[PDB]
Write a protein that holds these residues in place. Structure first.
Motif, PDB file in Angstrom:
ATOM      1  N   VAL A 144      -7.428  -1.803 -11.916  1.00 41.14           N
ATOM      2  CA  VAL A 144      -6.920  -3.114 -12.287  1.00 41.14           C
ATOM      3  C   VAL A 144      -6.582  -3.809 -10.990  1.00 41.14           C
ATOM      4  O   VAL A 144      -6.881  -4.987 -10.793  1.00 41.14           O
ATOM      5  CB  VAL A 144      -5.624  -3.005 -13.076  1.00 41.14           C
ATOM      6  CG1 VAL A 144      -5.685  -3.877 -14.309  1.00 41.14           C
ATOM      7  CG2 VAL A 144      -5.358  -1.557 -13.414  1.00 41.14           C
ATOM      8  N   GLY A 145      -5.936  -3.058 -10.112  1.00 38.63           N
ATOM      9  CA  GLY A 145      -5.552  -3.595  -8.834  1.00 38.63           C
ATOM     10  C   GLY A 145      -4.342  -4.488  -8.911  1.00 38.63           C
ATOM     11  O   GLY A 145      -4.458  -5.696  -8.807  1.00 38.63           O
ATOM     12  N   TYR A 146      -3.174  -3.907  -9.120  1.00 40.76           N
ATOM     13  CA  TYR A 146      -1.958  -4.693  -9.152  1.00 40.76           C
ATOM     14  C   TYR A 146      -1.356  -4.499  -7.767  1.00 40.76           C
ATOM     15  O   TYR A 146      -0.549  -5.301  -7.279  1.00 40.76           O
ATOM     16  CB  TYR A 146      -1.017  -4.153 -10.211  1.00 40.76           C
ATOM     17  CG  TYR A 146      -1.483  -4.375 -11.625  1.00 40.76           C
ATOM     18  CD1 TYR A 146      -0.909  -3.681 -12.680  1.00 40.76           C
ATOM     19  CD2 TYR A 146      -2.447  -5.326 -11.924  1.00 40.76           C
ATOM     20  CE1 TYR A 146      -1.275  -3.932 -13.992  1.00 40.76           C
ATOM     21  CE2 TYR A 146      -2.817  -5.581 -13.241  1.00 40.76           C
ATOM     22  CZ  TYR A 146      -2.223  -4.880 -14.263  1.00 40.76           C
ATOM     23  OH  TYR A 146      -2.565  -5.136 -15.565  1.00 40.76           O
ATOM     24  N   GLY A 147      -1.778  -3.416  -7.125  1.00 40.04           N
ATOM     25  CA  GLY A 147      -1.280  -3.110  -5.800  1.00 40.04           C
ATOM     26  C   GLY A 147       0.208  -2.824  -5.728  1.00 40.04           C
ATOM     27  O   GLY A 147       0.801  -2.917  -4.664  1.00 40.04           O
ATOM     28  N   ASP A 148       0.816  -2.470  -6.851  1.00 39.77           N
ATOM     29  CA  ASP A 148       2.230  -2.182  -6.846  1.00 39.77           C
ATOM     30  C   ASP A 148       2.517  -0.791  -6.335  1.00 39.77           C
ATOM     31  O   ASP A 148       3.603  -0.545  -5.817  1.00 39.77           O
ATOM     32  CB  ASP A 148       2.838  -2.368  -8.237  1.00 39.77           C
ATOM     33  CG  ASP A 148       2.199  -1.503  -9.265  1.00 39.77           C
ATOM     34  OD1 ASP A 148       0.982  -1.613  -9.439  1.00 39.77           O
ATOM     35  OD2 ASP A 148       2.907  -0.719  -9.914  1.00 39.77           O
TER      36      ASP A 148
HETATM   37  K   LIG Z   1      -3.972  -6.232  -5.073  1.00 42.38           K
END
Ligand SMILES: [K+]
Ligand SMILES: [K+]
Lengths: 90, 219, 212
Positions: free
Chosen positions: A48-52
């Motif tokens: 998803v790539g939330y990068g959290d």
């Molecule tokens: K990101």
């Protein structure tokens, strides 16, 4: 093939445990509790790539790769299927 | 029931080393981490390190000087912290705690008081403390018991095996020439005494010595 | 590594009042902050986890608030049993860390000391020792002075005092003065008194006893 819907959960769970085992000990690692670890998996497998959350350890990145290869592949089959199962009803 | 069992005390001579313990019970998982926290009298809590028995890996606090080495023993459910070459600085209470890998310490150990001294272990002397013959008494009465000549800390003074708890003051020990001395106190109604027996159970872990002493009126 | 600032270090509140301890992170940590209680000589005790989530076995008097870098632990209607040291601990980034600590302190109504003098025990004398003890119990404020007179004369040698931290039963204080002589030095003095000077009474509270 819809048994991959398990290979994923296996991976996801393995990814969790190992990620933490891998990450803890590294000053500043945010992947150090099993729950977040799971979301991280799911997060990764789907990309998803939330990068959290992400690994900082030389090793954690490895568990990452494994979770990616196994999980992306895996998660890719779960969808391939779910795409079919819909083509039918319609 | 109590989940983490830690030895009340452990004496150590400078340069020497002790291997503390912590035996578990209750629920156990492969996601469990056992932590160790140092605490010098007066000051707060200091994380020392952690270990995952269901794998054996351990990480330590990099700020402080490494004086420990964690190990675990799956079968007996016991974690071991090895503290080497100690100094006055290392003397303090050390707690072990269980963390479900979710970040917080749900349960903690009673902690092991550790003293780094050249001194020798000395069990305490427990003398009674009943009012002087001419002590006019009122609705309540105060009895106690003196605990001196013991080393190192700590000691646990209970009253009537713990059944007597309301109205008890155990003053902080005072050190003098390598020996500690403290006194506990208990207040009960004047009536209830001495018809109802009142004893002070005193325990000293560093010598495996627990003693009872009934407090009856002076002759 | 993350720094947990706990200030003020001491909090003085009146019974039944509401009190708030604050913990500040050196960087945003979301809600990965946890609270522990530690009473005099006890071990830490989880009070609140994840900043607000409650814990079973803990009074509904306790609550948490905040996110990021500012957190507050609250108590509605403080009380003697709440006198302790409160710590905050974070699990956002490795390695977990602790707050410096915050001592709660209840301010009650002035109480006068309950003095009680005690003669040394024979069991002890039988070993050449003579410890005359005196108790100054359940007073408040904690400020108090105790004096030793032997046969009417002030004594300062051999006297060891010991004070206790505020009590979590009644928010008071207590002290233990212990004059220790040899059986000899004891065998040659008639009466021993113990005077207590406390803000509750201009004139001192005394307790004596003669050896015969
Ligand atoms: K990101
Ligand atoms: K993508």
């Amino acid at each position: 093939a819809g048994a991959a819907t398990v290979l994923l959960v296996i991976v996801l769970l393995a990814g969790s445990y190992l990620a933490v085992l891998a990450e803890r000990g590294a000053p500043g690692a945010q992947l150090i509790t099993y729950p977040r670890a799971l979301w991280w998996s799911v997060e990764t497998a789907t990309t998803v790539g939330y990068g959290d959350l992400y690994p900082v350890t030389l090793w954690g990145r490895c568990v990452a790769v494994v979770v990616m290869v196994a999980g992306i592949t895996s998660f890719g089959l779960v969808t391939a299927a779910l795409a079919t199962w819909f083509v039918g009803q319609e | 029931q109590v989940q983490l069992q830690q030895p009340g005390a452990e004496l150590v001579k400078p340069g020497a080393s002790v291997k503390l313990s912590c035996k578990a019970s209750g629920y156990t998982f492969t996601s469990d981490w056992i932590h160790w926290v140092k605490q010098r009298p007066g000051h707060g809590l200091e994380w020392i390190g952690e270990i995952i028995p269901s794998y054996g890996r351990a990480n330590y606090n990099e700020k402080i000087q490494k004086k420990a080495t964690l190990t675990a023993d799956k079968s007996s459910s016991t974690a071991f912290m090895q503290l080497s070459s100690l100094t006055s600085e290392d003397s303090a209470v050390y707690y072990c705690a269980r963390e479900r890998g979710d970040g917080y310490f749900a349960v903690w150990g009673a902690g092991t008081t550790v003293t780094v001294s050249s001194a020798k272990t000395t069990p305490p002397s427990v003398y009674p403390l009943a009012p002087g013959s001419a002590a006019q008494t009122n609705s309540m009465v105060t009895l106690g018991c003196l605990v001196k000549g013991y080393f190192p800390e700590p000691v646990t003074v209970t009253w009537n095996s713990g059944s007597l708890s309301s109205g008890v003051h155990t003053f902080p020990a005072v050190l003098q020439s390598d020996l500690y001395t403290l006194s506990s106190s208990v207040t009960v109604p004047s009536s209830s005494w001495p018809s109802e027996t009142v004893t002070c159970n005193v325990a000293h872990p560093a010598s495996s010595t627990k003693v009872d002493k009934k407090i009856v009126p002076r002759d | 590594d993350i720094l947990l600032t706990q200030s003020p270090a001491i909090l003085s509140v009146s019974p039944g009042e509401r009190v708030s301890f604050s913990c500040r992170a050196s960087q945003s940590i979301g809600t990965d902050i946890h609270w522990y209680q530690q009473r005099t000589n006890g071990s830490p005790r989880l009070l609140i986890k994840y900043a607000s989530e409650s814990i079973s076995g803990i009074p509904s008097r306790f609550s948490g608030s905040g996110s990021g870098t500012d957190f507050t632990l609250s108590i509605n209607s403080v009380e003697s049993e709440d006198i302790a040291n409160y710590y905050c601990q974070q699990s956002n980034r490795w390695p977990f860390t602790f707050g410096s600590g915050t001592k709660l302190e209840i301010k009650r109504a002035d109480a006068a000391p309950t003095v009680s003098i005690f003669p040394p025990s024979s069991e002890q004398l039988t070993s050449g020792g003579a410890s005359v003890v005196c108790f100054l119990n359940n007073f408040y404020p904690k400020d108090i002075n105790v004096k030793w007179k032997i046969d009417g004369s002030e004594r300062q040698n051999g006297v060891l005092n010991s004070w206790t931290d505020q009590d979590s039963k009644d928010s008071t204080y207590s002290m233990s003065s212990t004059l220790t002589l040899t059986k000899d030095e004891y065998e040659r003095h008639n009466s021993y008194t113990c005077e207590a000077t406390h803000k509750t009474s201009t004139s001192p509270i005394v307790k004596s006893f003669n050896r015969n």
